[PDB]
Structures are given as structure tokens and as C-alpha cells.
Amino acid sequence: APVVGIIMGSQSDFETMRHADALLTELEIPHETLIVSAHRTPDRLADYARTAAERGLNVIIAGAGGAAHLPGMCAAWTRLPVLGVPVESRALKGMDSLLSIVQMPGGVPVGTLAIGASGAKNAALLAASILALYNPALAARLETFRALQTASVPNSPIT
Amino acid sequence: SAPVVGIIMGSQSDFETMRHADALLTELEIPHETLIVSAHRTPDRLADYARTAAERGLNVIIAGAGGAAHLPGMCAAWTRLPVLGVPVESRALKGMDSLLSIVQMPGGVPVGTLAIGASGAKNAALLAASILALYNPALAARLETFRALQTASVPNSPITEDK
Amino acid sequence: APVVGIIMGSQSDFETMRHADALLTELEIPHETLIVSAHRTPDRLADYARTAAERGLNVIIAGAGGAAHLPGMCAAWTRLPVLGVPVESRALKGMDSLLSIVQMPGGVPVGTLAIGASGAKNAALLAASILALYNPALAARLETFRALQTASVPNSPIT
Amino acid sequence: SAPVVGIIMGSQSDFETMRHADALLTELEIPHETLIVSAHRTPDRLADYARTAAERGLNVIIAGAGGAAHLPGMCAAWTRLPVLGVPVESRALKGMDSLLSIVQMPGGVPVGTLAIGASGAKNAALLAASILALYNPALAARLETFRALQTASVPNSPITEDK
Amino acid sequence: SAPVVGIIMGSQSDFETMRHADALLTELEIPHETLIVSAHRTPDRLADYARTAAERGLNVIIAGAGGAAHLPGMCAAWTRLPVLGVPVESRALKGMDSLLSIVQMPGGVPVGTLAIGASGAKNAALLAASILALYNPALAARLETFRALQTASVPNSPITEDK
Amino acid sequence: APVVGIIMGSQSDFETMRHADALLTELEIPHETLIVSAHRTPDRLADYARTAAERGLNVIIAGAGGAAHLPGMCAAWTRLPVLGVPVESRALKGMDSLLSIVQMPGGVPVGTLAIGASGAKNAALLAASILALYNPALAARLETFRALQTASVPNSPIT
Amino acid sequence: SAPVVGIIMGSQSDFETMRHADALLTELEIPHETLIVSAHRTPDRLADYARTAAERGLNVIIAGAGGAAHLPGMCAAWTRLPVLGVPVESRALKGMDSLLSIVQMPGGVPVGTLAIGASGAKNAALLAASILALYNPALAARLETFRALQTASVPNSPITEDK
Amino acid sequence: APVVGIIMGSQSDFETMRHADALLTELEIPHETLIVSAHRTPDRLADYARTAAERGLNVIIAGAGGAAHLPGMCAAWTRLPVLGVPVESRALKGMDSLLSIVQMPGGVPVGTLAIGASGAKNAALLAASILALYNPALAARLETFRALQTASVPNSPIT
Ligand SMILES: [K+]
Ligand SMILES: [K+]
Ligand SMILES: [K+]
Ligand SMILES: [K+]
């Protein structure tokens, strides 16, 4: 049963959001990966978000670009933590994505990650760190992940 | 009597800006309603408002919000009516967050966006009037009178006041 | 007889504005598609805008890039609704286009759409939603368009 | 009694913003500690604070700083706990330097970033509460009550006051 | 006596900025006219002003506007005279909208653009003077005197006043 | 004898500044085209600018990118009109170039044109419009240029 | 007694910012001179100042200016000494024009750039001190004491004052 | 024994930081070139910076991109001068890198250079100018470098 939902506005967003999917798989976190469009499927979004907690989801990772409303509107309909990934847009390079996700008025939060693939990977890692608070086996796997990441950095660059 | 434009805004704070749209529609004798609808705090209210707007006889929606401003776009997601968006000026980023949040709609769901702040609220009312005037000759005449007076009221030279 | 006029500053703008043309054609909205340069053909612009209403146009869609003055100056000369499309510029990625179109002082409006092809498509859709207020057959075709757009969004991404 | 959230900030000046996180955690009855930790002036204090946070029983860290804002990211470098970042508004660049310094973490070390300023501090507390509520039914009920009251307190229309 | 520079601006509000151009041309004894011409509210006035400027004996036009600032560019579209543009500072975007609206003219129709605000108005007058001085030896001498005094008036060290 | 000097910081700037050179040649305006680096050849710059008027130059067109100081420092040393062309920089797309040229404090002006090739072409046209005030034959050629530019704009785009 | 750092600035207005560099060098007992040099109004003064700095015994130059800020870069063009640049905050663009004008030096002629405003002036003095301390053990000790006290003066928790 | 340390967050940063390495080599300045990640190897960073002075380093050049914390955190742990190079990031073109390096609060300085390769070259040259204050042979080589740079600028561009 999935405990993280990864949602994104379109197939084009998957080039970015696949990095969240891959990370959750590496850490053996059960998850679902879906397309939900805030603008084209607003009722699908409302249903997805309002039923997420009763379906057993613990965290939602939502990615969108441009006037990026998917994470904020998801958070409007769920008390679950919602993490937002700004997808890089063609013209404004994700600055529109970033501001339309992070600048939520007080009362409905979205935890926002970096523009692009780094943000997708980090949304998955942040979801993992949330789940690790209550899952000791996962906490150990996350500590192994962080230890390997630290230990694997080379000491000098190659030409 | 029945409203043909709906003005919606995220908050009482937003009304400092959106009141200019309200006032201008009244000046042009366009029946309208003026409401608070919060995209984030009242999302079900928004869905219901937008999806029933056409059947209630509304022709245009003017929506204003600031920051991560989702109200105009999500309204447009649920109505086939034209939606006009006013970016309300935000404290830190001066409405640039508001502007990009509203204007950068992906293809398929439009929001016609006006200037940041009071200028945009005034112009949203005027753009709504322009839309309605296509089918309403009396309003078209009032709008033409408005534009003519606006043009006639521009002086030829500025006033110097060194005091 | 055309009821929407699509105008643009140059041939180079057509790579963007063709998306408005295509959408109007799909919805069977009679329209004209023309080049009008605010800076190189200012008298052509004045004549086009001032005669638009008497020629039977209902909406003007105007696209331009850089210091983009075509939509605003069109609106100066007509009481018709004018919709502006910021064309992506090479250096500043349409941010110059966007600010020079959207930041109209009160008194002369331009309804502005997104930078680039999305904005061109959406200007056509916004024009359609305006015309649909008075044309029941078009209103039904626009509702079919929106219904198909909603229904066609996949539920999950493909690898 | 023992804290489960740590709120850390770079300076007393930052507390004008971060006090909103402190107040909201108290309202939701979430035990927490509220501290000054300077990334640049007390880097060893930061390393020790972050690396011992989990063993001390903390579950979430909320970190706020402005300008070249390194406190949230460097905290995240030393803890496996979720770190939430609040960009404190800076004088010249209005928190844009704060925001980019915090949110643009390269892949591998996350900071969940909230809005510039007081809005972000309030929302960092609410996001922390959302995280804790996953395992705490009493808190989940308090959070649901909070959201319900927030929704119920939005009026239907704005107030006009021309004075 | 007859004007050789025309200073045009979109509004009375713009004159708070453009008055500095007016004052500096007077100081340099350059005959000029100072007018309000609105690109959006008086577009026919603008077309007539620009297309007749050369035949009326004008040599340079200085045009100032803010926001979506179209006055300098549209003036340049209708005259072969050099047009200098002053971006007037706007409230929300601090004249960045004004600046990009004026300076980013596509190839074929130039506007020589000066700094945002009063600095740009002063420098538009000085640039106009530089242009006119090419053909007017008396003015060239006055301009050289101006620059010499400006240089001579810079002190060697600053003043400390802790009070 | 040259009456316009086109100067630029480096060979790399010539990809942009060649458009000024071409325009002046088309209009038969005698000119010189040179490399002068504000940062690498500051004494060359001082000498060039301070002697420009006595050498018979009427206008200087100066192009530079990044922290672009060439136009402003030229204007510091000459009473001639100085026109500045922001060269597009790799990272910041000429926004650094633009702000470092246009934002001159009052007292020493630089008339600034658009980022990139458009700005180079327009600096040449603006120089031509300055020279045309005193040269009737050139004024007629400039009016022909503007008339041809206006007349040559197509009425509709090609697919 | 003889100065080893030169602080130069474009104007008296700039001294509101650059005075912080002056004060901090005095606190660290670093002999220095503090001058106004205008890149645009006194370009020959600048050339002479920069080209003679090394022979006069200066080791570091701290230069501050705003807007289209050319003073640090042109100083660096004429001296082989390290030049540190302080972007002075500008009115409209909040020092972003100052910052990009100073930091974006093409390869070959460096300016070590500090933060916009007073923070940058303080840090230019500290960076100059760090450079001088490489060869001056007494100054190195004073700088180490400064950093130690700075660290020791950071409290563990903030002060709440609801009044 | 190295007197300059060049450090960078990752192998990917070396495409930029190699230009600092090359310049120091040209000027015969002994140096070390290393990878140190502020986020993945924070203890490596603390150790590197705190021991730098006792190891005989005089200047540290630190390059990083995105949320770029390496230079500032290095400066937190050393009294040596720290020079920061903003590495160009994919989405925001190094503007995130630049602001996260240059905007240091008073008390802990980082001398910041341009975004990208120019900044890396200039960090090396600025380090050289610092070392030249105390090393007469190096001062002469740096003056030769600057003289050659000045003398080598062409007088006119090539087509
Ligand atoms: K009058
Ligand atoms: K009520
Ligand atoms: K004096
Ligand atoms: K204490």
C-alpha cells in the first residue's frame, strides 16, 4: 500500500518527477506515481487530495511548472504534508514555478524544493526523512544512504 | 439587477485593491457581485462558485489574489466563462510572485491578466465592460463616452509647483 | 466575416502566433491573421485598430516581443477587448515582452496571457470564451473542447 | 514536555519573523525549543546542534535566516531529520537572496522551504505539525480543528469603509 | 526662442521626474517646450506631435513614461529625429517595467535610453545638449564649462557627522 | 574622415557590433571600428575618448558585456554623445550589461540601446539621426531608409 | 602611520555606507585613508590614484559606488593591488545594478565583491584585514580576538518582547 | 607547499574551477585543488577550513553553484581570506549561486567574483595579487601578466 503519492501536472513533468520515483524505489518506500492536472482535472485533484489520508498516504510530492498551482491546491484539500517541486519552465527557467509554489500565504503550507531534478530527488529524500521518524528499518536505510553519499565524494577532481 | 460580472478576491486585505474594480463597474452601470473566495482556505467554495457561475447568469469573472496567487487560475479551471486576473501587490516581492502565478497559465485554461495593483483592478473592470459592450449597445455608448472623456481630460502641459 | 483579428509585429512572431490561428480554426471561429508593426507601421496600426469595430471584429489578439507595444497601442485606438501575447525574446526570455504588455496604466486595458505558445493558444481560447457568451453553437463547441481536454489527461505517466 | 521541534534562527533580528512559528507550535500544543544558532558566527554550535538533534528526541527542525542564508542547509547537512527553511526578508533584496540561498539545495540534502517572511514562519510550524500528526492522533485532531476553523472564518463578502 | 528640444511625458505625475530635464535645459539656455502627451489616452495627439516635430524645428525629443511605457518608442516610430527615453520609476516594480518597455526596442526604430528616475531625466537633457553642441559652438562652450565645474566640485574626502 | 567611432571591448563583441558597422556603411556614414577595453586598456580608452572631438568624431557607439564600463568611462572623458550597446552575456543574458550601462548617475549620460544585435543596429540608426540634423543629404537617405522599412513590412505571415 | 588601505567612494552620499569600513579599520588599528574619487566626474583623479597606489605603500583598495558602479572595476584596471568592491544600495533597484556592475568583471581584472550595503562595507574592511594579517602577526592576533568575541557574543536563545 | 587552496563542491564544478588552477600554474603559485562538499561532506569542510592556516595556506578559492554555501562556511571556520566563485547553475544561470555567496552578513567576509569561468580566473588573479604583496618575484610575474594582457588587446576587430 503506497505511503507516498507523487503527482504531476502532465507527462512532460515526468522527465523531472521520475527522479523522485527512482529515489523512493531505491529506499524501498511504497508509492504511487500519477498525473493530476490542477487546471485540466481540478475535480480529480480535489478527490485525490481529500481522500489521500484515508487511503493511507502519509506524504504527497507534487510537481508542476509555470503558473504552478498543483501543490498548493493539493495542500488546500489535505492535512497531510505536501512537498512541492518546481518544474523548470521553458521561458522563465522555473522562476515562475518556484514563486507560484513557495509563496503560500500562512495557513496552508507547501514545503518547496529546488527547481528541477534536484528538487524532485530532494522531495523524495525529505519524504523519506518524514517516514523515518516512525519506521526504524527505513531510518536505518536512510542513514546508510546519507553515509554512502558522504563517503563517496572524491577528494580531488579528475581532468 | 442580476449580476453579470462576479468580482472575487482572496481576502479583505485584497479588497483595498479590488474595490477599484467594484467602483468602476458601478460607474458604468454594470450589475455585479463582489465576494471573498479563498483558493486555499475555501477550495470547495471556489469550485462551487466557478462551476455554477454560467448557470447563474454571470458573463465575466474578475479574480484578484497575491503571493502564490491561485484564485484566478483555479476559477478558470472550473468555468467556461472568461476569467480576468488581477495580481495583488505583495509585500516582499511587490506582486512579481502574484503576476507570474496568474499570467503563466499553461495552454488550455486561460486567465486574461492585468497590471499589478490598483491599475489592474481598474482595467479588469474596463476589460469586462469591453466584453459586455459587444452585446449591449447602451453599455457600448457609456464605454465610448468614458474613453472620450478620458482623452479630453489630458492637459497639454504640466503644472510647475516649487514650494 | 472575421470576428477575431490576430495581429503580430513580424513574420518571426508567427512561430508563436500560429497556435492562436490553429485554435480558432479548430473551433470554427472566423478570423484574420495579419502582420502589423507598432514601430515600423504605426499608421497601419492606428487604422487597423480604429476601424476594427466597424469592420465587425469582436476581439483582437495581438502578439509582440521585446519592448512590446502592439497590444497596448491597439487598445488605445479601439474599445474592443484586446488580448496580448508576450512573444519570447532571445535575451530576456519574454520578461521584457511580458512587462511591456501587462503593466498598462488604468484606463486602457490589455488582457495578457502567458509568454510564448501557451499564451497564443490561451488568447484564442479566451477570445472563444468571450464569443461564446453570445453564440450558443460556439458555446457548445467550447464546452466540448474543455470536456475533451479534461477527459484526455492520462492517469499515470509513461516511461 | 521534552521538545519534538527545534526552531533555530541566525539572530535576534530573525526572531521578529520566527516568533510566529514559536507561537503557532504553542497554540497547537507541540513541545519545542527556540534557539539562536549562527551558521557563520557559531558554526561549531550548529554542527553539534544538528548532529545531536535526533538523539535528543527532536523530530523536525525549523530554521530561519536571511541574506546569504546558510543555516537551514548546513543544519540539513548534519541531521537526517526533516529540516524546514524560512527565508527571512532582507532589506535590499526583499528576501530573494534568502529564498534562493535556502530552496536551491542540490540533490542529496533537502530543505523544505516556505514563503519569505512571517507567512513562511507560520507555515513552517503548520508543516511541522502535519508531519507530527502522522503519528499523533490527538495532534491530528487539533490540526483538523485548526483547518476547519480557518475555513469557517472566511466571510462571504468584503467590508467597504470609505472614511 | 523657438524650441529645439521637446520634452514630453505621459502625465502630471511623470513631471515630478521630467521637471529635472526641463530645469537643466533652461540652465544650459536651450529653448524647449514641455508637454503632456499620453500614448494610451491621446494616441492621435502623439502621432501628430511626433510626425510634425521635425518640420516645427525640433531637433531632439525627450520622452518619459512609466509602467508599460510606450510613449518614447511610439514617438520614435513617427519621427526621424533622435528620441531619448526616460524610464519613470513605477511603484511596484521600481521602474524595471519602465526600463524594459523603453530600452528593448527591436532593430529599426531606436530610443536612446537613460537611467530610471531623476538621474535619467537630468542625463536626457545633458545628452540632448551634447547632440545640439555638435552644431552650436556657444552651447558647446557652456557644456564644457558645466562638465569642468562638475569635476572641480568633487571634494577629495568625505565629511563625518556622528550626531 | 570618420564622424562616428564604434568601439568594443573585445573581438567577441564584434559578433554584435558588426551590425552597427553594417548600418553605417549602408547609410554611407564615414566611421572607424575599433577594439578598446575599459579594463585591459584603460589608458587607450582615456586617450581615445579625450581626443575624439578634436579628431572630428561626432558620436561614439560603445559596446560591452558583463560589468560593462566602456560606454560610461568613454562618456566621462568626452562631451560627445555616447551611445551604449549592452552585449549579451552568457550567464545573465545581458541584464548585467544593461544595468551597468544604463544606470548612469546624473551628470555623465550614456544613451542606451537594446541588448544585442538590435541595440547595435539601433545605435547606428540613432547616430545617423543625430548626424542628419546637420547633413541634408544624409537626412534624405535616412528618410528613405525609414520609408523602405515601413513599406516593406508584409501584410500577412507566411506558413 | 602611513596608510596601507585606501577606502575610496564615488560621493558623500556613498559615505553613509562606506563609513562602516572606515570605522572597522580604525577598530582593528589598520592605518588607512578615506577619500572621494568619482569614476565619472573625476576620471583622471581615479587613474592617478590607482596607478600610484602601490608606490605610495597601499596594500589593499576598498572601493564603493552605486548604480552603474564603475569605480571598483576601473580602479582595478589601473592597479595590481587587490581591489575589494562594495555595492552601494541604489534607490530604485536596491543595489542590484550596483552589484552586477561590480561583480561581473570579465576574466583578467578582478574585483573581490562584498554584499550590498553596510554589511559589505564592514566585510570589505574585515577581508582587507585578513589579507594584511597574512604578513602582520599583531594584526592576525587582533583579528582572531575579533572573531572569538563575535562568536562568544551570540546568545543561545532570543528575547520575547510583546508590548 | 601549497599557499592557495582551490576547493569545489563536485566534479561538475571543475569545468569552471579548472580555470583558477590553470592561472595559478601559469604564475607558478603552489596550490592544491580539491573537492569539498558543504552539504555532503560538512565535517571535511570544517576540518579543511579550520586547519588551513596552520597548514600554510594563505588564500582559499571556493567554488559552488545553486544554494552555494561552500565559500561562506569555509570563511566561518578560517581567518584566511576566502574568495568565492559562483558556478553557473542550469536553471537560474548562477544568480542563485551569486546571491548565496556574495550576500554575507557583516562579520564573516567572502570576496566574490563573477559567475562562471571569468570568476574562476579572476579568483586566481586576486589570490595572486594578495600573495604579491609579500613576494617580490611573484609581484614581478603578475606585473608581466597584466602588461601582456594590456599590450595584447588588438586595435581593431577581424571579420
Ligand atoms: K489644460
Ligand atoms: K460574514
Ligand atoms: K573640499
Ligand atoms: K545569553
Short mmCIF file of N, CA and C in Angstrom, two decimals, chain H residues 33-102:
data_model
loop_
_atom_site.label_atom_id
_atom_site.label_comp_id
_atom_site.label_asym_id
_atom_site.label_seq_id
_atom_site.Cartn_x
_atom_site.Cartn_y
_atom_site.Cartn_z
N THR H 33 44.20 21.52 -5.30
CA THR H 33 42.89 21.59 -5.93
C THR H 33 42.07 20.38 -5.49
N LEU H 34 40.98 20.63 -4.77
CA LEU H 34 40.28 19.57 -4.05
C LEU H 34 38.77 19.69 -4.18
N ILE H 35 38.08 18.58 -3.96
CA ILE H 35 36.63 18.59 -3.83
C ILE H 35 36.27 18.54 -2.34
N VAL H 36 35.45 19.50 -1.93
CA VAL H 36 34.91 19.59 -0.58
C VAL H 36 33.45 20.00 -0.73
N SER H 37 32.52 19.15 -0.30
CA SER H 37 31.09 19.46 -0.41
C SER H 37 30.55 20.01 0.90
N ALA H 38 30.03 21.24 0.88
CA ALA H 38 29.45 21.81 2.09
C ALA H 38 28.32 20.93 2.62
N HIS H 39 27.55 20.34 1.72
CA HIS H 39 26.35 19.62 2.13
C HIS H 39 26.55 18.14 2.31
N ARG H 40 27.40 17.54 1.48
CA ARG H 40 27.66 16.10 1.59
C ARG H 40 28.84 15.78 2.49
N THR H 41 29.81 16.69 2.60
CA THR H 41 30.96 16.44 3.48
C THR H 41 31.21 17.62 4.42
N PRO H 42 30.23 17.94 5.27
CA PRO H 42 30.36 19.13 6.12
C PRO H 42 31.52 19.01 7.13
N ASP H 43 31.81 17.80 7.62
CA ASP H 43 32.93 17.64 8.54
C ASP H 43 34.27 17.78 7.82
N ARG H 44 34.36 17.29 6.58
CA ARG H 44 35.55 17.51 5.76
C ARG H 44 35.78 19.01 5.58
N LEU H 45 34.71 19.77 5.35
CA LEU H 45 34.83 21.21 5.20
C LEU H 45 35.34 21.87 6.47
N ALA H 46 34.74 21.55 7.61
CA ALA H 46 35.15 22.14 8.87
C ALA H 46 36.63 21.88 9.13
N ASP H 47 37.08 20.65 8.92
CA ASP H 47 38.48 20.29 9.14
C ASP H 47 39.40 21.03 8.17
N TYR H 48 39.00 21.09 6.90
CA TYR H 48 39.82 21.75 5.89
C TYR H 48 40.01 23.22 6.24
N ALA H 49 38.91 23.90 6.54
CA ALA H 49 38.98 25.32 6.81
C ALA H 49 39.70 25.62 8.13
N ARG H 50 39.39 24.86 9.19
CA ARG H 50 39.99 25.21 10.47
C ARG H 50 41.50 24.94 10.49
N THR H 51 41.99 24.00 9.69
CA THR H 51 43.42 23.70 9.67
C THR H 51 44.19 24.43 8.57
N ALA H 52 43.50 25.20 7.74
CA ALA H 52 44.13 25.79 6.56
C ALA H 52 45.33 26.68 6.91
N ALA H 53 45.16 27.57 7.88
CA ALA H 53 46.24 28.49 8.24
C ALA H 53 47.46 27.75 8.79
N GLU H 54 47.24 26.76 9.65
CA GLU H 54 48.38 26.06 10.24
C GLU H 54 49.09 25.20 9.19
N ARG H 55 48.38 24.82 8.13
CA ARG H 55 48.97 24.07 7.03
C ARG H 55 49.76 24.96 6.07
N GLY H 56 49.69 26.27 6.27
CA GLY H 56 50.45 27.20 5.46
C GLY H 56 49.69 27.83 4.30
N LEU H 57 48.40 27.53 4.17
CA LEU H 57 47.61 28.20 3.14
C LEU H 57 47.50 29.68 3.47
N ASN H 58 47.47 30.51 2.44
CA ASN H 58 47.29 31.95 2.60
C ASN H 58 45.94 32.43 2.09
N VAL H 59 45.42 31.77 1.06
CA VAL H 59 44.15 32.16 0.45
C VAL H 59 43.37 30.91 0.09
N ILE H 60 42.06 30.92 0.27
CA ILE H 60 41.21 29.83 -0.21
C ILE H 60 40.29 30.37 -1.30
N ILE H 61 40.25 29.66 -2.42
CA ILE H 61 39.31 29.93 -3.51
C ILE H 61 38.27 28.82 -3.48
N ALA H 62 37.00 29.18 -3.30
CA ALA H 62 35.95 28.19 -3.16
C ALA H 62 34.87 28.43 -4.20
N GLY H 63 34.53 27.39 -4.96
CA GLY H 63 33.50 27.50 -5.99
C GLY H 63 32.33 26.57 -5.73
N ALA H 64 31.12 27.07 -5.94
CA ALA H 64 29.92 26.26 -5.77
C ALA H 64 28.75 26.88 -6.52
N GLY H 65 27.75 26.06 -6.82
CA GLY H 65 26.57 26.53 -7.54
C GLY H 65 25.27 26.20 -6.84
N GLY H 66 24.20 26.89 -7.24
CA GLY H 66 22.89 26.71 -6.64
C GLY H 66 22.82 27.43 -5.32
N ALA H 67 22.27 26.76 -4.31
CA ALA H 67 22.38 27.23 -2.93
C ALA H 67 23.81 26.96 -2.51
N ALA H 68 24.66 27.95 -2.75
CA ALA H 68 26.11 27.79 -2.72
C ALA H 68 26.64 28.25 -1.36
N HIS H 69 26.92 27.29 -0.50
CA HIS H 69 27.29 27.56 0.88
C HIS H 69 28.76 27.32 1.17
N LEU H 70 29.48 26.71 0.23
CA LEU H 70 30.86 26.32 0.49
C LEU H 70 31.77 27.52 0.85
N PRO H 71 31.75 28.62 0.07
CA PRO H 71 32.65 29.72 0.45
C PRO H 71 32.32 30.31 1.83
N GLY H 72 31.04 30.53 2.13
CA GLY H 72 30.67 31.19 3.37
C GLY H 72 30.99 30.34 4.59
N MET H 73 30.73 29.04 4.49
CA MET H 73 31.02 28.15 5.61
C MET H 73 32.52 27.95 5.77
N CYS H 74 33.28 27.98 4.68
CA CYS H 74 34.73 27.97 4.79
C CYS H 74 35.19 29.20 5.59
N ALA H 75 34.68 30.38 5.23
CA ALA H 75 35.08 31.61 5.89
C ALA H 75 34.68 31.62 7.37
N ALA H 76 33.59 30.92 7.70
CA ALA H 76 33.17 30.78 9.09
C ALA H 76 34.23 30.11 9.96
N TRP H 77 35.03 29.23 9.37
CA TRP H 77 36.00 28.42 10.11
C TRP H 77 37.46 28.83 9.94
N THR H 78 37.74 29.86 9.15
CA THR H 78 39.14 30.31 8.97
C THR H 78 39.23 31.83 9.01
N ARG H 79 40.37 32.36 9.47
CA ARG H 79 40.61 33.80 9.36
C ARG H 79 41.32 34.16 8.06
N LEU H 80 41.66 33.15 7.24
CA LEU H 80 42.27 33.43 5.94
C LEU H 80 41.28 34.11 5.01
N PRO H 81 41.78 34.92 4.07
CA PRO H 81 40.85 35.43 3.05
C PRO H 81 40.25 34.29 2.21
N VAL H 82 38.93 34.32 2.06
CA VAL H 82 38.20 33.36 1.25
C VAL H 82 37.56 34.09 0.07
N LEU H 83 37.85 33.59 -1.13
CA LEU H 83 37.34 34.13 -2.38
C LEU H 83 36.33 33.14 -2.93
N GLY H 84 35.17 33.64 -3.34
CA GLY H 84 34.10 32.78 -3.79
C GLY H 84 33.79 32.92 -5.27
N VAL H 85 33.63 31.78 -5.92
CA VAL H 85 33.30 31.71 -7.34
C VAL H 85 31.90 31.11 -7.50
N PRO H 86 30.94 31.91 -7.98
CA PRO H 86 29.61 31.36 -8.24
C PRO H 86 29.64 30.52 -9.51
N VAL H 87 29.34 29.23 -9.39
CA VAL H 87 29.31 28.35 -10.55
C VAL H 87 27.95 28.51 -11.22
N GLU H 88 27.94 28.58 -12.55
CA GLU H 88 26.70 28.75 -13.28
C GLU H 88 25.83 27.52 -13.06
N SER H 89 24.61 27.76 -12.59
CA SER H 89 23.62 26.71 -12.39
C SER H 89 22.75 26.59 -13.63
N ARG H 90 22.11 25.44 -13.82
CA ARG H 90 21.38 25.17 -15.05
C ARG H 90 20.16 26.06 -15.23
N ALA H 91 19.30 26.10 -14.21
CA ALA H 91 18.05 26.85 -14.35
C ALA H 91 18.29 28.36 -14.21
N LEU H 92 18.88 28.78 -13.09
CA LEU H 92 18.93 30.20 -12.77
C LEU H 92 20.26 30.86 -13.16
N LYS H 93 21.09 30.15 -13.92
CA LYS H 93 22.25 30.74 -14.60
C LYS H 93 23.26 31.33 -13.64
N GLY H 94 23.31 30.79 -12.43
CA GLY H 94 24.22 31.28 -11.42
C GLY H 94 23.73 32.47 -10.61
N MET H 95 22.51 32.94 -10.82
CA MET H 95 22.02 34.03 -9.97
C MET H 95 21.78 33.52 -8.55
N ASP H 96 21.31 32.28 -8.41
CA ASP H 96 21.22 31.66 -7.09
C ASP H 96 22.63 31.52 -6.49
N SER H 97 23.58 31.05 -7.29
CA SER H 97 24.97 30.92 -6.83
C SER H 97 25.52 32.26 -6.34
N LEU H 98 25.29 33.30 -7.13
CA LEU H 98 25.83 34.61 -6.82
C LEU H 98 25.26 35.15 -5.52
N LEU H 99 23.93 35.14 -5.37
CA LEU H 99 23.35 35.76 -4.18
C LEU H 99 23.68 34.96 -2.92
N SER H 100 23.77 33.64 -3.03
CA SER H 100 24.06 32.83 -1.85
C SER H 100 25.54 32.92 -1.44
N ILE H 101 26.40 33.46 -2.30
CA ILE H 101 27.79 33.68 -1.94
C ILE H 101 28.06 35.12 -1.52
N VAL H 102 27.58 36.10 -2.28
CA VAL H 102 28.00 37.47 -2.04
C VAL H 102 27.30 38.11 -0.84
#
